Amino acid sequence: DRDKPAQIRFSNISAAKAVADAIRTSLGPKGMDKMIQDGKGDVTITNDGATILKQMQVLHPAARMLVELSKAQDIEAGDGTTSVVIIAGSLLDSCTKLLQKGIHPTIISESFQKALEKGIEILTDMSRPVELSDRETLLNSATTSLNSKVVSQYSSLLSPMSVNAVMKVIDPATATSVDLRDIKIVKKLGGTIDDCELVEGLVLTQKVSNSGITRVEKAKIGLIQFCLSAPKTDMDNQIVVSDYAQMDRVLREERAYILNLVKQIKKTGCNVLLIQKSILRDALSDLALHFLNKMKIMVIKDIEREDIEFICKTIGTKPVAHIDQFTADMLGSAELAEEVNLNGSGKLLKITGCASPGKTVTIVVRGSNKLVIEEAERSIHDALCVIRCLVKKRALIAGGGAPEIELALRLTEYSRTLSGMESYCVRAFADAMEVIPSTLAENAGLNPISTVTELRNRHAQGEKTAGINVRKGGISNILEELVVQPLLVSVSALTLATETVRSILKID
Amino acid sequence: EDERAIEMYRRRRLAEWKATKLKNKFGEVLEISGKDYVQEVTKAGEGLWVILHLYKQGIPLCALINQHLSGLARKFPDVKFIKAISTTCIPNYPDRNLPTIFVYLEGDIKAQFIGPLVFGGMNLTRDELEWKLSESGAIMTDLEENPKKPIEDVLLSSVRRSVLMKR
């Protein structure tokens, strides 16, 4: 029928509208302060839409579609996760009255497809290209990014990311293959922000042992996800709790069990080993450590799953679960060890293993303040995603809302010239396109109507004019107030927004 | 060297392991909801005098008594204690009543002190909450009696002094 589909469509429309306007007013550098309470006695102050949308949700599928759309846009480009939902909400608000006019979903879908094919072309023709081949092209593009980035009052001074990151993951130079797992990063407290440095090998940080001397080189340690604490006896006490009986018996059993194993493992070389965590293995042995002391011990314990996959990728040593499998796939080259707490804190070691020449790097961050671990961290993550997305687009566009109203004008002209049934639909699409610059003027605080009208007039004059300057609240070209972005962060956003609105409109 | 080196094994193993036989007594007070009360007449152990409570929120007196217990526990270690919330037990009784500690000597309740009046009404101090116990432990600070000497009525004692001093 029509009653049930219209009702479910209107309910989903209201849900999407509500979840949209919930975080609508936090887009741009002037997002306002908002406080939400979990209801477990805790309040938070933040101005970012992604985490706020992620923390809470209503048990309704319409919300789940927007959540997955936001997370897909986040993993895809890494920015503009709050404008995509705004465009989706505008398209929904338009198609409400569009279906009120009485249009079949097929017509609306194909008309939106044509309008998208037109607007993508308009956008690719509007943007200007840049070069990405050599070090100079990428370096000047990075300078343009960082001056168009968030205010760099600390990065321009400290720069634990301006050179360290971009240079130290330029090695696996093959295009569009740079995993995050390729750049595992360590941190540590103590020292100074002055230096964050480079080794082509993995770097581990935890206490090793206490023995005579441990700084040598040989074939790899040999990774074990082992357990070497005897199984706890099948009782809490023994048959008889006294001095005479049990000491005569179990002494030899244990001195054999905890010696024959290390005896066997001694068959392969390097006399050194690395172990996983100890959540199940209880009462770690010590006599074993004493024995390995006679047998040239140098060992690290309590290694982690994420690291247990990353190391097995770096150094090419297949794991081993238990003693009865030690044939091969348990070794690798190695060159040195024993890095110290040099001029600071956070003990770490510098195994520089060139066994697998497969590119790999790491990043280290010390500092005279734990707040260095807090302020320098994850900025490399972000700027690194920024240098990751540019490897394939090599094009960029200016901000300020100019492309929005430009596309709106071009699509209005298109609707005018494609006279027919689809003209009203593509026209409504053009109208819904231009919503952002008004919101930006509101975030800065002005009368948006006159400003957007003047800017639409100026883009009717030259089609490439000033944008929105947040510095003085005026209308100056982006070519002097450099706030630019790649083209994919917009192209992907528009195409996925059209895709999701079409898919949700087709379903009953 | 190796002998002395190795043979510290038995000096170390079975030595740290010599200390693996343990046993305990009790101290302080542990927060406990209703999930253990049911079998508690059988969970009592042997001779372990236990004490109870019952909680409400908003009563000036009910907060007080909850401090005196945890203090006393530091004095007497063998006994143990419990702090409980009345929502867990019978639903509409606890609202009109006041805290009633049902002492359990691994058996039937022995002293059930309901309602405010019987306590005294915030004239309580350690003394008025210890001699009223008189049943766990056998010390009681060797006080013969201490009722505050409930302040008297002036008429009755008049005829008494006449017939006893001039008899």
XYZ file of C-alpha atoms in Angstrom:
675
model
C 0.000 0.000 0.000
C 0.973 3.653 0.463
C 0.106 4.322 4.120
C 2.737 1.982 5.570
C 5.550 3.004 3.152
C 4.789 6.710 3.558
C 4.704 6.339 7.346
C 7.951 4.369 7.585
C 9.608 6.803 5.168
C 8.487 9.804 7.220
C 9.653 8.183 10.463
C 13.082 7.434 8.990
C 13.162 10.976 7.579
C 12.461 12.453 11.013
C 15.078 10.207 12.630
C 17.722 11.199 10.078
C 16.823 14.886 10.410
C 17.117 14.690 14.198
C 20.470 12.897 14.186
C 21.643 15.468 11.629
C 20.656 18.616 13.525
C 22.030 17.004 16.696
C 25.587 17.751 15.521
C 24.870 20.136 12.618
C 26.190 23.169 14.517
C 29.796 22.047 14.956
C 31.128 22.215 11.372
C 34.122 24.378 10.552
C 36.908 25.869 12.667
C 34.278 27.706 14.765
C 32.269 24.791 16.124
C 30.567 25.658 19.391
C 30.986 23.977 22.762
C 28.608 21.150 23.654
C 28.255 19.063 26.813
C 26.669 15.611 26.972
C 26.143 13.513 30.137
C 26.315 9.650 29.962
C 23.911 9.399 32.967
C 26.644 7.637 34.994
C 27.759 10.956 36.632
C 30.122 12.227 33.860
C 30.070 15.269 31.520
C 32.335 15.952 28.547
C 33.102 19.059 26.489
C 34.006 18.592 22.826
C 33.318 19.998 19.364
C 33.840 17.052 16.994
C 30.980 15.172 15.376
C 32.525 11.747 14.805
C 33.084 10.688 18.416
C 29.802 12.252 19.567
C 27.860 10.324 16.929
C 29.791 7.164 17.809
C 29.186 7.309 21.568
C 25.377 7.286 21.439
C 22.696 5.992 19.092
C 19.019 5.055 18.941
C 17.945 1.476 18.253
C 16.710 2.388 14.771
C 18.244 1.321 11.431
C 18.016 4.827 9.947
C 20.564 5.971 12.522
C 22.779 2.957 11.800
C 22.974 3.882 8.113
C 24.239 7.359 8.996
C 26.734 5.930 11.504
C 28.180 3.526 8.941
C 28.217 6.307 6.333
C 30.214 8.532 8.685
C 32.660 5.747 9.548
C 33.119 4.871 5.864
C 33.858 8.509 5.034
C 36.253 8.592 7.999
C 38.264 5.540 6.943
C 38.086 6.608 3.282
C 39.452 10.171 3.368
C 39.969 11.140 7.018
C 38.146 14.487 7.072
C 34.804 16.103 6.347
C 32.964 13.491 8.413
C 30.430 16.136 9.501
C 29.633 17.718 6.125
C 28.589 14.407 4.551
C 25.697 14.035 6.994
C 24.723 17.665 6.360
C 24.523 17.032 2.609
C 22.567 13.830 3.260
C 20.115 15.702 5.479
C 19.654 18.448 2.896
C 18.974 15.848 0.199
C 16.464 14.151 2.503
C 14.694 17.432 3.287
C 14.443 18.081 -0.451
C 13.137 14.635 -1.373
C 10.432 14.934 1.298
C 8.676 17.672 -0.670
C 9.794 16.015 -3.916
C 7.831 12.850 -3.110
C 5.068 15.089 -1.759
C 4.860 16.340 -5.347
C 4.167 12.714 -6.298
C 7.248 11.474 -8.168
C 8.154 7.819 -8.599
C 11.382 6.726 -6.850
C 12.792 5.454 -10.159
C 12.575 8.898 -11.778
C 14.198 10.553 -8.761
C 16.954 7.925 -8.677
C 17.899 8.234 -12.346
C 17.642 12.038 -12.222
C 19.966 12.122 -9.209
C 22.329 9.831 -11.119
C 22.403 12.229 -14.077
C 22.863 15.236 -11.782
C 25.740 13.441 -10.044
C 27.402 12.595 -13.361
C 27.124 16.277 -14.291
C 28.376 17.621 -10.962
C 31.365 15.279 -10.806
C 32.445 16.579 -14.214
C 31.900 20.175 -13.079
C 34.035 19.570 -9.985
C 36.890 17.855 -11.831
C 36.896 20.723 -14.334
C 36.818 23.369 -11.592
C 39.840 22.135 -9.636
C 43.448 22.781 -10.624
C 46.168 20.101 -10.776
C 49.577 19.952 -9.110
C 52.623 17.704 -9.350
C 53.569 14.854 -7.020
C 56.523 13.063 -8.641
C 59.772 14.090 -6.955
C 60.743 15.187 -3.448
C 60.308 18.900 -4.234
C 56.752 18.587 -5.566
C 55.643 16.580 -2.534
C 57.526 18.862 -0.132
C 55.927 22.044 -1.469
C 52.517 20.352 -1.503
C 53.139 19.399 2.134
C 54.046 22.996 2.985
C 50.826 24.156 1.320
C 48.929 21.544 3.336
C 50.506 22.526 6.658
C 49.901 26.238 6.113
C 46.343 25.335 5.086
C 46.267 22.937 8.065
C 45.182 23.653 11.625
C 47.181 26.457 13.253
C 50.765 25.207 13.498
C 52.058 27.333 16.381
C 53.756 24.207 17.790
C 54.498 22.125 14.687
C 56.269 25.009 12.941
C 58.392 25.368 16.090
C 58.881 21.820 17.392
C 58.353 19.835 14.166
C 58.244 16.211 15.353
C 56.097 15.612 12.259
C 57.146 18.024 9.483
C 60.184 15.968 8.417
C 60.285 12.876 10.641
C 57.017 11.462 9.362
C 57.056 12.366 5.702
C 60.650 11.308 5.231
C 60.623 8.175 7.329
C 57.727 6.605 5.518
C 58.831 7.545 2.040
C 60.634 4.215 1.686
C 57.875 1.830 0.550
C 57.528 4.131 -2.404
C 55.016 2.030 -4.387
C 51.856 4.043 -5.025
C 48.701 3.476 -2.956
C 50.215 0.768 -0.786
C 51.134 2.243 2.580
C 49.386 0.437 5.402
C 49.155 1.985 8.827
C 50.624 -1.262 10.132
C 53.676 -0.314 8.077
C 54.454 2.533 10.524
C 53.905 1.142 14.026
C 54.901 3.888 16.473
C 56.379 3.632 19.942
C 56.157 6.245 22.684
C 58.009 6.893 25.920
C 58.139 9.466 28.703
C 61.231 11.413 29.669
C 63.820 13.211 27.602
C 62.929 16.180 25.404
C 60.760 16.963 22.385
C 63.969 18.021 20.685
C 64.513 14.746 18.820
C 62.370 11.960 17.338
C 64.508 9.635 15.299
C 64.898 6.756 12.861
C 65.900 3.132 12.600
C 65.026 0.794 9.759
C 64.432 -1.928 12.335
C 61.900 -2.734 15.035
C 62.323 -1.270 18.524
C 61.257 -2.961 21.765
C 60.845 -1.379 25.191
C 60.628 -3.458 28.387
C 62.911 -4.898 31.051
C 65.097 -7.743 29.832
C 66.799 -9.596 32.709
C 69.521 -9.179 35.322
C 72.731 -11.048 34.524
C 76.397 -10.500 33.745
C 76.383 -8.719 30.362
C 73.881 -8.729 27.475
C 75.064 -7.031 24.274
C 75.913 -9.447 21.428
C 74.790 -10.301 17.884
C 73.833 -13.665 16.357
C 70.907 -15.358 14.568
C 67.521 -14.114 15.728
C 66.277 -14.677 19.267
C 63.468 -16.922 18.031
C 59.881 -16.055 18.885
C 57.958 -18.360 21.234
C 54.354 -18.102 22.371
C 55.322 -20.641 24.987
C 54.463 -21.479 28.591
C 57.014 -22.858 31.041
C 55.254 -22.967 34.409
C 54.383 -26.524 35.479
C 50.677 -27.451 35.406
C 49.209 -26.928 38.863
C 48.758 -30.263 40.624
C 45.352 -31.932 40.637
C 44.576 -30.752 44.188
C 45.138 -27.687 46.355
C 47.278 -29.693 48.793
C 48.731 -33.159 48.358
C 47.581 -36.490 49.810
C 49.463 -35.776 53.045
C 50.530 -32.341 54.297
C 53.736 -32.881 56.297
C 57.526 -32.858 55.990
C 58.375 -36.552 55.621
C 56.526 -37.654 52.510
C 55.990 -35.156 49.702
C 59.436 -33.526 49.602
C 61.064 -36.874 48.815
C 58.811 -37.348 45.780
C 57.861 -34.131 44.015
C 61.340 -32.552 44.219
C 62.752 -34.796 41.497
C 59.608 -34.518 39.364
C 59.849 -30.731 39.299
C 63.630 -30.519 38.892
C 63.195 -32.787 35.857
C 60.124 -31.094 34.339
C 61.673 -27.620 34.552
C 65.074 -28.733 33.222
C 64.371 -31.129 30.359
C 62.308 -28.507 28.512
C 65.052 -25.884 28.397
C 67.416 -28.771 27.650
C 65.421 -29.557 24.506
C 64.991 -25.905 23.492
C 68.778 -25.557 23.786
C 68.984 -27.668 20.601
C 68.466 -24.619 18.409
C 70.911 -21.776 18.840
C 71.027 -18.154 20.016
C 70.257 -19.161 23.641
C 67.664 -16.339 23.801
C 63.881 -16.132 23.630
C 60.803 -13.860 23.692
C 57.466 -14.725 25.326
C 53.854 -13.545 25.146
C 51.815 -12.269 28.104
C 51.019 -14.284 31.236
C 47.273 -14.115 31.842
C 46.969 -17.931 32.041
C 50.507 -19.116 32.800
C 50.901 -18.593 36.541
C 53.964 -18.869 38.795
C 56.675 -18.155 36.247
C 59.757 -20.219 36.997
C 63.039 -18.764 38.232
C 65.326 -21.793 38.212
C 64.824 -21.743 34.440
C 66.235 -18.221 34.418
C 69.151 -19.449 36.524
C 69.784 -22.247 34.028
C 69.676 -19.923 31.029
C 72.157 -17.745 32.930
C 74.625 -20.606 32.561
C 73.482 -20.844 28.929
C 74.012 -17.231 27.788
C 70.569 -15.743 28.347
C 69.209 -12.517 26.884
C 65.424 -12.471 26.941
C 62.353 -10.252 26.775
C 58.956 -11.223 28.169
C 55.358 -10.001 27.930
C 54.962 -9.184 24.260
C 51.597 -8.172 22.822
C 49.291 -9.490 20.087
C 49.416 -6.408 17.856
C 53.178 -6.536 18.171
C 53.089 -10.319 17.743
C 51.715 -9.864 14.250
C 53.846 -6.839 13.413
C 57.183 -8.401 14.397
C 56.408 -11.630 12.567
C 55.918 -9.411 9.537
C 59.092 -7.359 10.091
C 61.654 -10.100 10.663
C 60.117 -13.100 8.889
C 60.013 -15.548 11.815
C 56.958 -17.779 11.898
C 55.734 -18.294 15.487
C 55.898 -21.399 17.677
C 53.247 -22.436 20.183
C 54.871 -25.389 21.949
C 58.071 -27.395 22.265
C 57.100 -30.261 19.967
C 57.300 -28.060 16.844
C 60.802 -26.591 16.420
C 61.931 -27.715 12.963
C 62.261 -24.508 10.937
C 60.561 -21.111 10.633
C 62.060 -20.135 13.981
C 65.010 -17.876 13.170
C 66.230 -14.825 11.274
C 69.210 -12.536 10.845
C 70.186 -9.923 13.420
C 72.959 -7.387 13.734
C 73.047 -5.846 17.232
C 71.011 -5.106 20.362
C 71.162 -3.150 23.625
C 70.031 0.416 23.243
C 70.083 2.309 26.526
C 68.195 5.043 28.391
C 70.412 7.515 26.572
C 70.027 11.038 27.987
C 66.537 10.427 29.310
C 64.030 7.711 30.140
C 61.815 5.083 28.578
C 64.256 2.205 28.123
C 64.185 0.804 24.593
C 66.375 -1.305 22.328
C 67.466 -0.879 18.730
C 67.469 -4.227 16.911
C 68.388 -3.205 13.345
C 67.436 -6.319 11.408
C 68.027 -6.346 7.655
C 66.818 -9.944 7.252
C 63.677 -9.055 5.327
C 64.629 -6.066 3.127
C 60.880 -5.504 2.883
C 60.426 -1.867 3.729
C 59.393 -1.055 7.290
C 60.009 1.807 9.702
C 59.154 3.013 13.198
C 58.814 6.347 15.011
C 59.962 7.179 18.541
C 58.752 10.084 20.694
C 60.520 10.998 23.944
C 60.070 14.198 25.913
C 60.712 16.134 29.121
C 56.943 15.968 29.728
C 54.415 13.188 29.656
C 52.374 15.954 28.077
C 54.868 15.521 25.244
C 53.517 11.985 24.819
C 50.120 13.663 24.880
C 50.737 16.602 22.525
C 53.072 15.142 19.885
C 51.234 11.827 19.508
C 48.615 11.016 16.848
C 49.406 14.254 15.053
C 51.739 12.095 12.979
C 48.876 9.625 12.537
C 46.683 12.416 11.165
C 49.233 14.228 8.988
C 50.303 10.805 7.736
C 46.780 10.024 6.577
C 46.929 13.453 4.929
C 50.096 12.539 3.021
C 48.598 9.101 2.301
C 45.505 10.447 0.548
C 47.527 12.727 -1.750
C 49.545 9.876 -3.313
C 46.751 9.160 -5.819
C 44.786 12.401 -6.286
C 47.654 14.874 -7.000
C 44.941 17.533 -7.365
C 43.587 20.091 -4.926
C 40.831 22.681 -4.599
C 40.316 25.821 -2.543
C 37.822 26.027 0.305
C 35.632 28.904 1.386
C 32.400 27.508 -0.047
C 33.195 28.600 -3.609
C 32.777 25.087 -5.121
C 29.391 24.640 -3.423
C 27.721 27.706 -4.930
C 29.635 27.181 -8.184
C 28.176 23.684 -8.559
C 24.784 25.059 -7.511
C 24.858 27.661 -10.292
C 26.065 25.151 -12.886
C 23.377 22.638 -11.917
C 20.669 25.315 -11.994
C 21.780 26.133 -15.538
C 21.720 22.393 -16.269
C 18.162 22.051 -14.943
C 17.170 25.040 -17.070
C 18.643 23.523 -20.234
C 17.442 19.911 -19.726
C 13.751 20.933 -19.860
C 11.588 17.973 -18.925
C 10.430 15.847 -16.018
C 13.925 15.549 -14.513
C 14.525 19.316 -14.578
C 12.678 20.036 -11.331
C 14.506 17.193 -9.574
C 17.989 18.272 -10.652
C 16.982 21.866 -9.841
C 16.015 20.881 -6.292
C 19.345 19.059 -6.068
C 21.100 22.279 -7.097
C 19.189 24.236 -4.446
C 19.990 21.707 -1.712
C 23.662 21.754 -2.741
C 24.323 25.273 -1.394
C 23.924 25.120 2.387
C 27.489 25.230 3.807
C 28.710 28.853 3.360
C 25.657 30.142 5.232
C 26.497 27.788 8.102
C 30.098 29.013 8.057
C 28.967 32.645 8.204
C 26.726 31.711 11.136
C 29.609 29.969 12.918
C 31.662 33.134 12.497
C 28.505 35.172 13.118
C 27.047 37.429 10.414
C 24.000 37.851 8.187
C 24.430 34.881 5.817
C 21.796 35.839 3.222
C 23.495 38.942 1.817
C 26.915 37.270 1.895
C 25.805 34.144 0.030
C 23.898 36.256 -2.500
C 26.957 38.440 -3.119
C 29.208 35.393 -3.467
C 26.791 33.707 -5.878
C 26.775 36.936 -7.891
C 30.580 37.076 -7.944
C 30.725 33.445 -9.087
C 28.178 34.335 -11.750
C 30.754 36.963 -12.748
C 33.949 34.913 -12.976
C 33.063 31.441 -11.604
C 36.283 31.444 -9.533
C 36.324 34.166 -6.883
C 36.861 34.758 -3.171
C 35.580 32.275 -0.621
C 35.007 32.736 3.111
C 37.842 34.211 5.177
C 37.509 33.288 8.856
C 40.358 35.642 9.804
C 38.587 38.995 9.397
C 35.092 37.717 8.608
C 35.414 39.092 5.085
C 35.392 37.920 1.463
C 38.961 37.433 0.218
C 40.424 34.923 -2.217
C 41.792 31.635 -0.915
C 44.878 32.196 -3.090
C 46.153 34.607 -0.411
C 44.481 33.023 2.649
C 45.639 29.524 1.735
C 43.030 27.011 2.903
C 43.140 24.264 0.268
C 42.308 20.567 0.218
C 42.632 17.639 -2.198
C 39.801 16.881 -4.597
C 38.986 13.332 -3.478
C 37.776 14.483 -0.046
C 34.950 16.194 -1.964
C 34.432 13.847 -4.929
C 34.085 10.749 -2.748
C 31.833 12.617 -0.313
C 29.403 13.722 -3.024
C 29.292 10.371 -4.808
C 28.717 8.372 -1.619
C 26.059 10.855 -0.473
C 24.199 10.445 -3.763
C 24.642 6.666 -3.528
C 23.242 6.425 -0.005
C 20.319 8.781 -0.635
C 19.382 6.814 -3.764
C 19.637 3.481 -1.946
C 17.562 4.641 1.020
C 14.952 6.203 -1.273
C 14.568 3.050 -3.379
C 13.766 0.835 -0.377
C 10.111 0.805 0.675
C 81.531 -22.804 41.867
C 78.849 -24.715 39.966
C 77.948 -26.828 43.004
C 77.465 -23.768 45.198
C 75.889 -22.104 42.163
C 73.517 -24.952 41.301
C 72.855 -26.230 44.807
C 71.275 -22.935 45.830
C 68.372 -24.415 43.848
C 67.132 -26.468 46.790
C 68.135 -23.442 48.848
C 65.723 -21.400 46.706
C 63.176 -23.894 45.405
C 61.155 -25.570 48.169
C 62.207 -22.553 50.276
C 59.995 -19.901 48.746
C 57.828 -22.990 48.311
C 58.336 -23.736 52.011
C 56.216 -20.621 52.624
C 53.251 -21.927 50.590
C 51.248 -23.097 53.639
C 48.943 -20.357 54.930
C 46.014 -19.701 57.281
C 44.066 -16.618 58.286
C 42.091 -14.687 60.875
C 39.673 -11.785 60.201
C 39.711 -7.949 60.453
C 37.874 -4.718 59.376
C 34.380 -4.846 57.701
C 33.335 -6.114 54.199
C 30.422 -4.695 52.078
C 27.978 -7.530 51.295
C 24.708 -7.549 49.366
C 22.018 -10.217 49.656
C 23.759 -12.814 47.476
C 25.306 -14.684 50.442
C 22.705 -14.228 53.198
C 20.606 -17.258 52.242
C 23.085 -20.028 53.117
C 24.681 -17.790 55.763
C 23.419 -19.872 58.681
C 25.645 -22.599 57.177
C 28.349 -20.190 55.930
C 28.975 -19.098 59.526
C 31.982 -21.354 60.087
C 32.658 -22.552 63.630
C 31.977 -20.230 66.557
C 32.289 -17.173 64.298
C 29.985 -14.604 65.869
C 28.596 -12.482 63.036
C 26.684 -9.209 63.074
C 24.277 -7.672 60.600
C 22.745 -4.313 59.775
C 20.104 -2.744 57.569
C 20.464 0.487 55.647
C 18.263 3.356 54.534
C 19.179 6.736 53.085
C 18.121 10.085 54.515
C 18.034 9.276 58.251
C 20.365 11.291 60.530
C 20.736 8.336 62.906
C 21.273 5.605 60.331
C 24.560 7.076 59.138
C 25.927 7.374 62.683
C 25.656 3.733 63.768
C 27.344 2.681 60.543
C 30.522 4.319 61.843
C 30.545 2.870 65.363
C 30.633 -0.710 64.059
C 33.627 -0.333 61.749
C 35.477 1.267 64.649
C 34.669 -1.569 67.053
C 35.894 -4.151 64.553
C 39.421 -2.785 64.994
C 39.136 -3.670 68.679
C 37.832 -7.230 68.284
C 39.340 -9.109 65.318
C 37.654 -12.519 65.548
C 34.140 -11.189 65.038
C 33.181 -10.031 61.550
C 30.535 -7.663 60.247
C 28.184 -6.770 57.395
C 26.700 -3.533 55.926
C 23.435 -4.177 53.970
C 20.687 -2.290 51.999
C 16.984 -3.025 52.853
C 15.887 -3.041 49.162
C 17.505 -6.562 48.992
C 15.280 -8.033 51.819
C 11.435 -7.968 52.460
C 10.117 -4.760 50.332
C 7.650 -2.734 52.521
C 8.841 -3.529 56.105
C 12.382 -1.536 56.229
C 10.775 1.838 55.304
C 8.721 2.064 58.497
C 11.321 0.336 60.593
C 14.859 1.362 61.770
C 18.177 -0.647 61.708
C 17.837 -4.131 63.349
C 21.120 -6.154 63.591
C 20.202 -9.889 63.846
C 23.285 -11.435 65.498
C 23.771 -15.007 64.180
C 25.779 -17.525 66.189
C 25.568 -19.978 63.275
C 21.898 -20.384 64.082
C 18.690 -18.609 65.013
C 18.513 -14.878 65.567
C 19.304 -13.993 69.167
C 18.724 -10.248 69.611
C 16.504 -8.259 67.235
C 16.530 -4.530 67.992
C 13.873 -2.874 65.879
C 12.764 0.737 65.722
C 14.549 3.866 66.903
C 13.342 4.103 70.515
C 15.179 1.024 71.766
C 18.504 2.508 70.634
C 18.156 5.758 72.551
C 18.009 8.337 69.774
C 21.502 9.695 68.976
C 22.545 9.707 72.611
C 24.742 6.785 71.533
C 28.454 6.465 72.173
C 30.793 3.477 72.204
C 29.730 2.598 75.745
C 25.989 2.465 75.074
C 26.748 0.235 72.079
C 29.113 -2.132 73.880
C 27.474 -3.042 77.182
C 24.256 -3.632 75.291
C 26.180 -6.427 73.540
C 27.363 -8.396 76.573
C 27.140 -11.649 74.607
C 30.158 -11.767 72.232
C 33.506 -11.767 73.952
C 33.865 -11.627 77.726
C 35.646 -8.324 78.415
C 33.112 -5.452 78.269
C 35.695 -3.130 79.879
C 34.669 -4.647 83.235
C 31.874 -2.163 83.821
C 29.324 -3.336 86.350
C 26.506 -1.095 85.087
C 26.184 2.129 83.085
C 22.653 3.276 82.078
C 23.573 6.965 82.353
C 21.522 6.499 85.547
C 18.257 7.423 83.804
C 17.553 10.891 85.113
C 15.162 10.591 88.028
C 11.723 11.682 89.211
C 12.012 13.760 92.368
C 8.910 12.554 94.237
C 9.539 8.829 94.728
C 12.981 8.946 96.370
C 11.716 11.356 99.054
C 9.779 8.834 101.161
C 12.601 6.305 100.744
C 15.341 8.310 102.477
C 13.016 8.928 105.432
C 12.150 5.288 106.131
C 15.706 3.949 105.673
C 17.824 6.502 107.560
C 15.368 6.848 110.474
C 14.327 3.206 110.881
